[PDB]
Design a protein around this motif. Structure first.
Motif, PDB file in Angstrom:
ATOM      1  N   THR A 129      30.740 -18.002 -25.725  1.00  0.00           N
ATOM      2  CA  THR A 129      31.524 -18.613 -24.645  1.00  0.00           C
ATOM      3  C   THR A 129      32.520 -17.635 -24.017  1.00  0.00           C
ATOM      4  OG1 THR A 129      31.293 -20.900 -25.461  1.00  0.00           O
ATOM      5  CG2 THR A 129      33.215 -20.397 -24.121  1.00  0.00           C
ATOM      6  N   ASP A 188      30.405 -15.578 -21.778  1.00  0.00           N
ATOM      7  CA  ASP A 188      29.804 -16.310 -20.671  1.00  0.00           C
ATOM      8  C   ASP A 188      29.664 -17.771 -21.070  1.00  0.00           C
ATOM      9  OD1 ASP A 188      28.429 -17.294 -18.495  1.00  0.00           O
ATOM     10  OD2 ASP A 188      27.024 -15.620 -18.366  1.00  0.00           O
ATOM     11  N   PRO A 189      30.550 -18.663 -20.590  1.00  0.00           N
ATOM     12  CA  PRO A 189      30.415 -20.088 -20.931  1.00  0.00           C
ATOM     13  C   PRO A 189      29.098 -20.682 -20.488  1.00  0.00           C
ATOM     14  CG  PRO A 189      32.600 -19.677 -20.082  1.00  0.00           C
ATOM     15  CD  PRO A 189      31.782 -18.414 -19.817  1.00  0.00           C
ATOM     16  N   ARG A 190      28.379 -20.027 -19.567  1.00  0.00           N
ATOM     17  CA  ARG A 190      27.077 -20.491 -19.091  1.00  0.00           C
ATOM     18  C   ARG A 190      25.927 -20.221 -20.060  1.00  0.00           C
ATOM     19  NH1 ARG A 190      26.114 -17.031 -14.096  1.00  0.00           N
ATOM     20  NH2 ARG A 190      26.416 -15.568 -15.840  1.00  0.00           N
ATOM     21  N   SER A 191      26.126 -19.383 -21.075  1.00  0.00           N
ATOM     22  CA  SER A 191      25.053 -19.055 -22.006  1.00  0.00           C
ATOM     23  C   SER A 191      24.490 -20.310 -22.664  1.00  0.00           C
ATOM     24  CB  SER A 191      25.563 -18.117 -23.096  1.00  0.00           C
ATOM     25  OG  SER A 191      24.513 -17.740 -23.997  1.00  0.00           O
TER      26      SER A 191
END
Ligand SMILES: Cc1cc2nc3c(=O)[nH]c(=O)nc-3n(C[C@H](O)[C@H](O)[C@H](O)COP(=O)(O)OP(=O)(O)OC[C@H]3O[C@@H](n4cnc5c(N)ncnc54)[C@H](O)[C@@H]3O)c2cc1C
Ligand SMILES: Cc1cc2nc3c(=O)[nH]c(=O)nc-3n(C[C@H](O)[C@H](O)[C@H](O)COP(=O)(O)OP(=O)(O)OC[C@H]3O[C@@H](n4cnc5c(N)ncnc54)[C@H](O)[C@@H]3O)c2cc1C
Ligand SMILES: Cc1cc2nc3c(=O)[nH]c(=O)nc-3n(C[C@H](O)[C@H](O)[C@H](O)COP(=O)(O)OP(=O)(O)OC[C@H]3O[C@@H](n4cnc5c(N)ncnc54)[C@H](O)[C@@H]3O)c2cc1C
Ligand SMILES: Cc1cc2nc3c(=O)[nH]c(=O)nc-3n(C[C@H](O)[C@H](O)[C@H](O)COP(=O)(O)OP(=O)(O)OC[C@H]3O[C@@H](n4cnc5c(N)ncnc54)[C@H](O)[C@@H]3O)c2cc1C
Ligand SMILES: [Ca+2]
Ligand SMILES: [Ca+2]
Lengths: 445, 447, 441, 455
Positions: free
Chosen positions: B81, B84-87
């Motif tokens: 996170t 990249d919180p989008r991972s």
């Protein structure tokens, strides 16, 4: 407690009437109360006692009664409960007398407002008005001989007239708290105010609460953080800066095993350690002195800083800022300009222009040395410091001082008795010990 | 990530498949996803990567999976996170995949059970099973030369022992990551004995030694950090008739500092600041910043232990007769463990400059993080002249003599770099961000 | 307090020696202490008092002394402090006498373990051992046209013998009786929460057996039992059956909780019958019908961990079934388990035991007082207490020196605090003044 | 992100309002079109023609109640995307990462951001849809559209809006309409019009200009007992340190919000199905048994601070009638009297208890009214299409997917109207909150655009 005439030879004279002396008065009252000590039913003579207090009435750190400030200690550690919960001088009984006990219960807190705890102690102190001389600032303690010293003469200056009066006593307690500790580099100036005079002196200097004053705060313990936080509310348009030597405000350790160092029975353990062990123990528990900050307040300050970050990611542009690992190298404060210029440098082995500098650097507890200079020759040969025994009585040369005369110290004995010595933590129990040390034999009849 | 044939020349081999290596796997997967970085649609070859793990399947400190044990760190510091919180590998996405996200939200906690966080990392790890070789314990790293008469090393051969058969296997790789955590640190005075067990083997080994949950065992616990307290607390439940004793050098269990300014030393972006400080400042900061990593106890656990002692005080005011006791400011001077007697005698003294007879002694004294020195002994002659230690740069690559090692070959260290990179180095705190840095360091040009 | 001979005419007899009677005893002791009230140095005669308690020793809800159970009320609301913090019977003085005061202070809690608060009241109760007859179950109160005293008959719980004592004044302070749903049958496997710790281990002796145990209810006691069973019988399968859709938290907020203040009794009592009835509804979110927030969260966390291990709730070891009612229980036959039939409150379980945590009725005084109910004013079919808890009597049938007082069953007239510990200290003071005031002057 | 559609083209969807509810729809449409999040979207080469009309001049979220220190009442995990897809670029955590603030928020150790921050998060989301939002446009009516005069069947709608700055009327045509307009201020009837009587929704925007001198000893009354009432009452005491504030409540006490985990499961997204399938009677009853989690109650922490503040007054003076700041429980306003701006207003009070009788008069410089909102403004907006409802219906009836019932013989199924945020009676207490917007935004996209996105 009944009064003794000013010119009679007293059994005990206490210098100062803050919580430490007040705890002694309360414990003496309780020891004479047949309800509390069964044997006290057969005591028909009160010791001749007197208290000298510089203030005009009882007051507790009024310069730091900041709005919303709370006690840092459980109310159970009031001036009586840990010695005798039945005492009339307990905090809960005070609340009962004010009609406030149920209302305090619904707060569900062990930490009263400091304003409230001051009122509790004021209410206790008012019951000792016949034996407290207010407006008397003690200036010296002098030996007396009636070739062995067997009494002391305590000279005090009346705050209203300046006249010096003298009282004679067999025994003396010095319980005068601390004096403001200022870093030696700072100059004297009305814009440089110690934390002890925050509430009392700063509002007069900065009278318009809406003005964008620049106000710096020096320090990183509880008082500094409280002042930094309070300023932002009191002067909503101000720019405040907290200057600290450390890298971060550190939280006080509130965990239960660690806080046992404040237990009354722990004074026995601490006192019995060697000097080397006492010295290191006082540092292995540094995290509970006034050098740290209540976690809740750290979190509140952090949250306020975070909200500034939301509005502006550049910390140097914040209205309110913390500067860690800095030291003051120079203050410019001469000239018609109303702001001072503070020069800062890294504190590892930049200038602010401010309307005021609050200095929250704690206290010295050595003022008894000046008061006792004229009796320091009665100490054992070779001693350059006052050495308190376990019962707080200072060592004297027995061939120079009668065993019925003596001097006790209160509140300045951290080195020998532990971190609790300057706090409220053990006053109730200690007041009882002091009564036994000073009056025990006298009360045995 | 697709597998590389075991006998082929790898681009990267990572030793260990704990959180540190897993975060690298995750970060590499994310670097190859054209949706997460647009500048990746034009990558038609995945790097050749493999991970070697000595345990037989993914597991995280399984010897200390005590019932009710909690994470010591916010779940936001998961393995992706902060990078990249989008991972797809965030903790919140794991919960969503398991159908549990709203239910976790209602817990209103940042500290999941250790059981759940292990399962999260297990869920991540299963997605790399094609490139992880389990049951392989690396024992050495040796120089490799494509041309044997070249004076320059251009790959390394990594030898591993099969934990089930003992066979040694060899793999070739241009680059090596060592991410092997810590080894049990035992006080030098203690003898070897099956009844003296390190905290890392608590859940797996102590139940085998003490099989009768109803026997009134005497069990001592040495230490005062998080693991000692968790073991001390758990023993009282697991052996309800036991008599447990916590032996500590310090005067008290001390709480972890959860205050927000102090904990900024764990921020990912502090690694640059710390690394660039002088040796003297870094050495001093490691003392002054915060008490050591697991050297203190979560406040909540201290209070629970304290309350349990108070309840003993309610039942019996005599502390010396309590079933469970804490002996502070003590050190062990001698352990007697020979003879047919099944209990050992522990001799105690003050810890400033008594005897227990116990069925077991749990030793919760932390870890050493030097095992890479042994693994790398056969390539340490490739270091610059005069070095007796492996010295990592900011991007964790160890210094090599450029005339002895090709610039396409190298060795990185992970998790053992506290002296140069800060207290966060051995924790979960910066793994997500560090995995991203490691991918750029190792594969950046190739990508 | 000195004992008075059993066959003499007593001034006061109290039925029950729980917290309510204990607070009266404590307040009477304090009224006689010249140290606490100066007007007592010239009081040379102790009143003749006696207490009858059915248990064999002082005990406070021992069927619910579950491990880890905590007080739901601040220790300041002990049996004396709100009346006089100087009393020797405060919780803090008790801790001081036990050498534990600084140690409790370091706990930083207002809510002691129930085990500890019971020991506090036990420590208080031992100071009245000369005026308490334990193991005496009161069975009737009989008049004695001016009834000017009462005879209280009690059955000894160990021998079965009935004994009688005479007194001018009576207090009834007997708490509550188990409220059981009228649809449930009698069966040793169906146990009320009041006998949990006391009776269930006798029924289910093997702590390791995989018993099926149901819990009926959704209040504090239901949650405590549900939570405890999972630790006490670790391999069991427990089921919480509730009519409501969820466990609801107790309101700890300060403004709402002012209804429990002692000085509120005056306000509540003076309200009309209509306002008291509505007020009891519009603030009933605190009646043991709700659960300590901390406990709800612990139970929810335990359920969550089951979800981590298995997403299928129907397979969980421990389950909560909301919006359910019991329609039929089969309990006839040699099979060790009963079969419980459930339906929506807007499916069968087979259980080794059913714990029923449905609270208490507080009407047991009516049976005890039937033989004096003709002394009520004409037309009254209920006992009606005045503000000072003395029940109304016909003045032409009852001497003004005789009377009967009720304690703990007066929620309708005195407020939700009436059955709790909340106002016992202050009420004990009022009770001493009501019953003994003139006598003390 | 989403490309704009020309104003005079036939839209696929026009949404009235651009608050959080419409924003969740925009976000969910974006995510449905994102090949990273939906596998089937690399083969979608045509974006639906969507437009949003918002009456405020820019995105703003309850700006009248952005009181200092005010916090979210809900976990940040319940943002506009995460419960639907934590991988979404519109998660709160991704927002923090984009601002360089994620580690800093982590060190706060809170699930409840400041309202100021959560508004900025949603403003950050809204900025990415700036090509399809027309701000300063107040929709005033929705009228039927018949694309064929040779037919009686309505197959589109025309939405008219008045530009708030110029007054011009603009018209756009659309097949489908979403009405997501939040609430209008609920004011006690009988009050006179006076600019000093301010609803809570206008607190931060209107009161400070009215009472300019923060040092003056103003008398300020606050009406209500919910979260907004308590925040205003508390804030006034800090903003105006010498004021005398009075909180007037019908209830006997401020009540705490229920934060317990089992009760709060009524807010779970998957609970909308269960609630919706219940009978009218069961839904009505269920709404009453859970009215202790609305904005009608107060966060426990705030109650305690207010109680503590009252206690400190007790310490200085035991006489509650002399306190600077007071709470008057079980009161109702019988009348508010004013005599012009030159004078203070008089608030007259009586007991709110049944007429089974203490009374008071207050003289105040301002009255803050924190009495909630009505959520029926869609009826006025839809008045010119209400004849298209099925026979006998006097109310708009939304199906499970929030589309309102229409007479199929009068309206083509390629046209429709959806309601958002006003459906508590059919969809539960969460309907007007942030609680299920992420999941609901997904459902709305499937309801409105599903077929279109498939083909
Ligand atoms: C805001 C605040 C800050 C604190 N900071 C610290 C700290 O930095 N370090 C620490 O260890 N403790 C600190 N404390 C704790 C404090 O010392 C105790 O709470 C308590 O005040 C100790 O009581 P005392 O009577 O020993 O001293 P005091 O409270 O100081 O009482 C001393 C009294 O003696 C009087 N007096 C002094 N000199 C004379 C004289 N020559 N003649 C006559 N009377 C005299 C004073 O007027 C005063 O009333 C702080 C407390 C507060 C509230
Ligand atoms: C119970 C507990 C206790 C902790 N105690 C500490 C502590 O005392 N101090 C501290 O700073 N941090 C401690 N931590 C934090 C911990 O280090 C991190 O959470 C995390 O485990 C670090 O990941 P890592 O991958 O660097 O190490 P690990 O979790 O240790 O992963 C290392 C992996 O390498 C494998 N491995 C080791 N050697 C070889 C080999 N020769 N060949 C192949 N595989 C090998 C291991 O099996 C393991 O899977 C503790 C955490 C927990 C849960
Ligand atoms: C676990 C638990 C559950 C609780 N549940 C509730 C609840 O559901 N609702 C509620 O409003 N309050 C409840 N309370 C609060 C409780 O009522 C008070 O804490 C307190 O017990 C009241 O004291 P009391 O003396 O009026 O009753 P008790 O504590 O009940 O005392 C009654 C005493 O009278 C004795 N007695 C009974 N009958 C006779 C007899 N015929 N003859 C002689 N002696 C007799 C009993 O043995 C007992 O000692 C509960 C408390 C606890 C600890
Ligand atoms: C301080 C505060 C108080 C709250 N009080 C309540 C409450 O009392 N009850 C409750 O159930 N929820 C309440 N909430 C929760 C709130 O409803 C949600 O947080 C959220 O605002 C709902 O989003 P929405 O888009 O459905 O409505 P809103 O957020 O109010 O958004 C509606 C938008 O539509 C716009 N709009 C309105 N009419 C028109 C028009 N004719 N033309 C064009 N645009 C228009 C508005 O300007 C607004 O931007 C409150 C929240 C806060 C922060
Ligand atoms: Ca924190
Ligand atoms: Ca409370």
């Amino acid at each position: 407690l009944r009064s003794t005439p000013q010119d009679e030879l007293h059994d005990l004279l206490c210098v100062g009437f803050g919580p430490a002396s007040l705890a002694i008065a309360i414990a003496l009252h309780d020891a004479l109360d047949p309800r509390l000590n069964k044997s006290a039913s057969n005591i028909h003579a009160q010791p001749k006692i007197c208290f000298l207090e510089r203030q005009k009435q009882f007051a507790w750190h009024s310069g730091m009664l900041v709005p919303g400030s709370k006690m840092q200690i459980s109310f159970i550690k009031d001036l009586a409960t840990l010695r005798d919960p039945r005492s009339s001088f307990t905090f809960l009984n005070y609340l009962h007398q004010k009609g406030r006990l149920i209302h305090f219960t619904n707060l569900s807190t062990f930490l009263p407002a400091r304003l409230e705890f001051e009122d509790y102690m004021r209410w206790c102190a008012q019951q000792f008005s016949d034996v407290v001389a207010y407006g008397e600032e003690v200036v010296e303690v002098i030996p007396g001989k009636s070739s062995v010293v067997d009494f002391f003469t305590v000279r005090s200056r009346n705050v209203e007239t300046g006249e010096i009066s003298a009282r004679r006593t067999r025994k003396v307690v010095i319980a005068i708290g601390g004096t403001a500790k200022m870093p030696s580099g700072l100059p004297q100036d009305p814009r440089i105010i110690h934390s002890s005079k925050y509430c009392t002196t700063l509002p007069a200097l900065l009278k318009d609460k809406s003005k964008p004053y620049n106000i710096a705060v020096l320090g990183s313990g509880q008082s500094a953080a409280e002042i930094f936080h309070d300023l932002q509310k009191r002067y909503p348009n101000s720019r405040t800066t907290l200057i600290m030597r450390d890298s971060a405000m550190r939280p006080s350790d509130d965990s239960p095993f660690v806080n046992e160092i404040f237990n009354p029975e722990r004074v026995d353990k601490f006192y019995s350690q060697s000097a080397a062990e006492r010295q290191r123990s006082l540092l292995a528990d540094k995290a509970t002195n006034y050098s740290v900050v209540r976690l809740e307040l750290i979190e509140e300050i952090y949250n306020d800083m975070y909200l500034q970050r939301v509005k502006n990611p550049d910390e140097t542009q914040w209205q309110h800022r913390i500067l860690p690992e800095r030291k003051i190298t120079r203050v410019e404060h001469h000239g018609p300009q109303s702001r001072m210029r503070i020069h800062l440098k890294s504190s590892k082995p930049e200038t602010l222009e401010v309307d005021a500098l609050m200095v929250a650097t704690g206290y010295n507890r050595n003022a008894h040395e000046r008061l006792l200079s004229k009796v320091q020759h009665l100490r054992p040969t070779g001693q350059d410091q006052w050495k308190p025994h376990r019962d707080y009585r200072v060592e004297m040369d027995p061939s120079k001082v009668s065993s019925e005369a003596g001097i006790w110290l209160q509140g300045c004995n951290e080195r020998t008795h532990g971190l609790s010595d300057s706090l409220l933590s053990v006053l109730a129990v200690r007041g009882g010990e002091m009564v036994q040390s000073i009056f025990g034999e006298q009360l045995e009849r």
